[model samples]
Target: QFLSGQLSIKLWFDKVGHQLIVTILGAKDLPSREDGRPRNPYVKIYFLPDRSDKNKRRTKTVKKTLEPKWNQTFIYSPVHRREFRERMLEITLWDQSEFLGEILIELETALLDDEPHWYKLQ
Candidate 1:
């Protein structure tokens, strides 16, 4: 039996454009694009793990970007191992142009089956 952990993340858009990009080291890659038009736009983020259970993979949205707030959360079961490695978590916000960004989360295999950790975006 593997122990489960939870990670918290937050995102904020301080600018408006069609090419908003943010990158983290080994965690995530997010790309966002805006088409400078008059329409309802949104951002989509994808989470990819180095070694994950494809069948047991799951994602949860803890927050949403209304008009002045942008926040999201995702939880998943990491692979069990004996060594420590860097995990990558990618996020992309797009509408019509191409505004992208990313963030990296740290993971210690030795602590994978231990307790959950929390993280916040700035």
Candidate 2:
């Protein structure tokens, strides 16, 4: 199965948030065989932020974490809303031994301006 092999992929998103977090969950080590064989697998989580300028394509690893059961969470603070909107967000998950599953969530602010018109009331 595809899960038996190593997997490294990146996910992209567009949003604005004051902070960012990453989490993962799964078996870090491969299952042992009846014969007492060991297959240790690992997964690495990375969060990258896209460049603000369209002319330039640059990205940096904001945070990284590892887990055995595939459950890990990371939190970043003071991420300006304006700055986040200016750039894109991408999450990358790589398995050093086996391909594990991962999920990325992005938080942003919503613009809501609702006011009743005086004429409508009449």
Candidate 3:
């Protein structure tokens, strides 16, 4: 629903380059963890079957705003496209917190014969 702000994500595969590009367009009306305050949101992305911090990618933090505009593009090299099959695409929304809670928002995209499309935050 437009009443709740949503994330805008775009994904693309660079077949010749063996790379994946991620664009985090931004989000709106996020679920607030704080009382009467907006989340200072950022996103953490992973290419699973391996979710080590070393392989994690992130968008920049946009502070104190209910509506955030990231417009950030991230690029990563994947060894093979079929590797993308075993690994589901993972993207989660997180903001700075007084206390770090486990599991805020997540998308575990089941992508086999995946279509080129837009995905929203969990």
Candidate 4:
């Protein structure tokens, strides 16, 4: 019912800076298109409930591979103490212009510690 793959990421909160940091490590076992063409894959992120253009961030596209390693980090600053506990994180995967899948992580229950994890795309 959805795109199949796994996305690797690491996240944590910077209490001192009042910031939220996310690292997009990469993806694995992604399916190629029906035509068997190699995909140009990348990532898109949003701190949810704020879908505005300025809230969007993305990674560079890595071409012709199912396993792409981004190792790229993005930091969202000035995040209030209350906002970090209330906001949701949405990480979406894409193939060029096409949508692949996404995973949502609620800040309240996660990211208290810094560690890499894999999420099944849906």
Highest-scoring model, lDDT: 4
Taking the tens digit of each residue's C-alpha lDDT, what string does model 2 give over 1-122? 31222222222222355554333233323334345544334434333353333212212221222323434444444455555444333333333343333433243432111211111000
Q: What is the TM-score (0 to 1) of candidate 4? A: 0.91
lDDT minimum window of 10 residues, candidate 1: 18-27
Residues 59-83 of candidate 4 have per-residue lDDT tens digits of 9999898899999999887677687
Name the better of 1 and 3 by lDDT: 3
Candidate 4 weakest lDDT stretch, 10 residues: 77-86
Residue 6 error for model 2, in Å?
12
| C-alpha lDDT (0 to 100) for residue 57 of candidate 3 | 83
Best by TM-score: 4
Superposed model 4: Cα runs more than 4 Å off: 1-3
What TM-score, over all chains together, does every model reach? 0.32, 0.33, 0.72, 0.91
Residue pairs that clash (backbone atoms under 3 angstroms), model 3 = 5-28
Give Cα-based local distance difference scores for all models: 0.30, 0.33, 0.62, 0.87
Task: Give Cα distance to truth, residue 97, candidate 3, Å.
Answer: 2.4
lDDT of 3 by residue, 1-122 (tens): 33334666666667788877767687766766536777788877776667787557888888888777888877767646667546555677777644212222222243322233334444
